[PDB]
């Protein structure tokens, strides 16, 4: 039987859960009859992303209703949905294009998980757990509840989470220390960059096999840009509040996963409203979206040069921002070093 700790074994079961894959699809109104799990394909997804982009273009120019009707139909031909009656919605706004793309990113990470899950030898020599654990190519270790690491973390979560957006309370079930294959070398260079911070990154749990296996990625060129306030990059937050909302949990499934990554920010190009960057000003190596709420600066703590902004949570200098919280975007995957993964339980106040 498996050598991995219990909590780790349970983490594997979680991310490699097939029923979760199906649930995510059915929750997208996807006909699993026509578009079964094993039918998903990278290529089918690039195509869908490209249709999505065309829609945005059509939406921006003000295309002639029929062009938006064929683009809409082209999308539902690619991604088979079930409505029965009423008919499929028209994709005629930045709003629908953002939802559909978000769904494609998720569906793509699910294709990756089902594909890893299937690839490799299925010889019962070793148990499913240890095997599927190998597939992630990252070293996972439990962090003891009573370690300074855990304490630092729990405090970061409590301080940066407030009664304001208190729709739920957060319980840290497990925290893991993680080191992906090749994150030690790829980062070593970018580490020679100042302003290194330990930030949050929340994502749906169905995306975790794909995130650990391939790392955080930047949207493909065919992806529409609507939805990326500061362009195609990797986003983080310094308040568990902002990230936790991307875990998409509910009273039905109240437990989610969230990452803590060390990101070498360099000089930050500060902005208050959306701006499609990607091409930064000289001397800038990251973008910082200024929010209304910041963790209290005085309480910031350190580590090997990695600042942990675990300050409680206060109003910031500028409120004339379109942001409730801060955002941090880097446009190079090498500027990211994932260090911890946390299993969180959401207790909704409802
Ligand atoms: C780009 C977008 C995103 N923006 C973020 C800002 C801070 C943190 C995160 C995160 N993933 O924790 C963000 N994710 C928008 C909707 C889904 N992805």
Same domain, 86 and 156: no
Query: Where does a domain end: 136, 160, 188?
Result: 136
Q: Are 294 and 162 in contact (CB under 8 A)?
A: no
Distance CA 225, CA 14 (A): 31
Distance CA 346, CA 170 (A): 5
Beta-carbon contacts of residue 265 (< 8 Å; ≥ 6 apart): 193, 195, 196, 197, 285, 286, 288, 328, 330, 335
Ligand 1 binding residues, C-beta < 6 A = 200-203, 227-228, 235-237, 242-243, 246, 327
Same domain, 166 and 55: no
Same domain, 130 and 242: no
Nearest CA to ligand 1 atom 16: 227
Same domain, 97 and 154: no
> What's the 184 CA to ligand 1 centre distance in angstroms?
24
| 327-330 and 286-289 beta bridge pairing | antiparallel
**Residue 148 catalytic?**
no
Name the experiment that determined this structure: X-ray
Read off the CATH number of the domain in which 239 is found: 3.90.228.10
Same domain, 131 and 248: no
Same domain, 92 and 171: no
Residue 313: CB atoms within 10 A of its CB come to 21
346: which 2 tokens? Answer: 């959401």
Same domain, 122 and 145: no
**Closest C-alpha to 164, from 51, 30, 325:** 325
∠ at Cα 189 (339, 267), nearest 5°?
85
User: Which residues pair with residue 171 across a beta bridge?
Assistant: 345
**Closest C-alpha to 199, from 238, 142, 147, 156:** 238
Give the rounded distance of the alpha carbon of 187 from its chain centre: 20
Q: Are 232 and 307 in contact (CB under 8 A)?
A: no
Q: Among 160, 238, 246, 249, say which to mutate for ligand 1: greatest number of ligand atoms within 8 Å of CB.
A: 246
Q: Which residue has the tokens 């942001």?
A: 323
Query: Where does a domain end: 136, 168, 186?
Result: 136
> What's the 1 CA to ligand 1 centre distance in angstroms?
38
> What's the 64 CA to ligand 1 centre distance in angstroms?
33
Nearest CA to ligand 1 atom 1: 228
Same domain, 191 and 317: yes
> What's the 320 CA to ligand 1 centre distance in angstroms?
21
Query: Where does a domain end: 101, 136, 171?
Result: 136
Domain count, the chain: 2
Three-state DSSP string of the chain: CCCCCHHHHHHHHHHCCHHHHHHHHHCCCECCCCCCHHHCCHHHHHHHHHHHHHHHHHHHHCCCCCHHHHHHHHHHHHCCECCCCCCCCCCCCHHHHHHHHHHHHHHHHHHHHHHHHHCCCCCCCCCHHHHHHHHCCEEEEECCCCCHHHHHHHHHHHHCCCCCCCCEEEEEEEEEEEEECCHHHHHHHHHCCCCEEEEEEECCHHHHHHHHHHCCCCCCCCCCCCCCCCCCCEEEECCHHHHHCCCCCCCCCCEEEEEEEEEECCCEEEECCCCCCCCCCCCCCEEEECCCEECCHHHCECCCCEEECCCCCEECCCCCCCCCCCEEEECCHHHEEEEEEEEEEEEECC
Range of the domain at 343: 137-349
268-296 in b/e form (b: 16+ CB < 10 A) is bbebeeeeebeebeeeebbbbbbbbbbbe
Distance CA 83, CA 132 (A): 36
Q: Are 232 and 217 in contact (CB under 8 A)?
A: no
Nearest CA to ligand 1 atom 13: 235
Same domain, 113 and 195: no
Q: Which residue has the tokens 């995957």?
A: 333
Q: Among 165, 237, 248, say which to mutate for ligand 1: greatest number of ligand atoms within 8 Å of CB.
A: 237
Same domain, 119 and 179: no
Side by side, the strands of the sheet bearing 168-180 are: 138-142, 168-180, 336-348, 255-264, 196-202, 306-307
**Closest C-alpha to 216, from 172, 270, 174, 180:** 180
Same domain, 101 and 146: no
Same domain, 156 and 128: no
Choose, from 54, 111, 183, 327, the residue flagged as catalytic: 327
68-77 in b/e form (b: 16+ CB < 10 A) is beebbebbbe
Binding site membership for NAD(+): which residues?
Answer: 201-203, 210, 217, 243
Read off the CATH number of the domain in which 40 is found: 1.20.142.10
């Amino acid at each position: 039987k498996s050598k991995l700790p219990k909590p780790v074994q349970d983490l594997i079961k979680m991310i490699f859960d097939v029923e979760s894959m199906k649930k995510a699809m059915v929750e997208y109104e996807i006909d699993l009859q026509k578009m079964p799990l094993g039918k998903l394909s990278k290529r089918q997804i690039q195509a869908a992303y490209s249709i999505l982009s065309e829609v945005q273009q059509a939406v921006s120019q003000g295309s002639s209703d029929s062009q938006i009707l064929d683009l809409s139909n082209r999308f539902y031909t690619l991604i088979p949905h079930d409505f029965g009656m009423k008919k499929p919605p028209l994709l005629n706004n930045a709003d629908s294009v953002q939802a559909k793309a978000e769904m494609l990113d998720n569906l793509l990470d699910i294709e990756v998980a089902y594909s890893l899950l299937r690839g490799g030898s299925d010889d019962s020599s070793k148990d499913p757990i240890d095997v599927n654990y190998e597939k992630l190519k990252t070293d996972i270790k439990v962090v003891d509840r009573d370690s300074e690491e855990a304490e630092i973390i729990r405090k970061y979560v409590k301080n940066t989470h407030a009664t304001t957006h208190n729709a739920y309370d957060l319980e840290v079930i497990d925290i893991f220390k993680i080191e992906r294959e090749g994150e030690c070398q790829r980062y070593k260079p970018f580490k020679q960059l100042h302003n290194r911070r330990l930030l949050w990154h929340g994502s749906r749990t169905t995306n975790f096999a794909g995130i650990l296996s391939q790392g955080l990625r930047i949207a493909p060129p065919e992806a529409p840009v609507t939805g990326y306030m500061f362009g195609k990059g990797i986003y983080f937050a310094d308040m568990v509040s902002k990230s936790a909302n991307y875990c998409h949990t509910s009273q039905g499934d109240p437990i989610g996963l969230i990452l803590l990554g060390e990101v070498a920010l360099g000089n930050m190009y500060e902005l208050k409203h959306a701006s499609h960057i990607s091409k930064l000003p000289k001397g800038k190596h990251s973008v910082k979206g200024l929010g209304k709420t910041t963790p209290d600066p005085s309480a910031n703590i350190s580590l090997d040069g990695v600042d942990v902004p675990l300050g409680t949570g206060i109003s910031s200098g500028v409120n004339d921002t379109s942001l409730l919280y801060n955002e941090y975007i880097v446009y190079d995957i090498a500027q990211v070093n994932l260090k911890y993964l946390l299993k969180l339980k959401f207790n909704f106040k409802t």
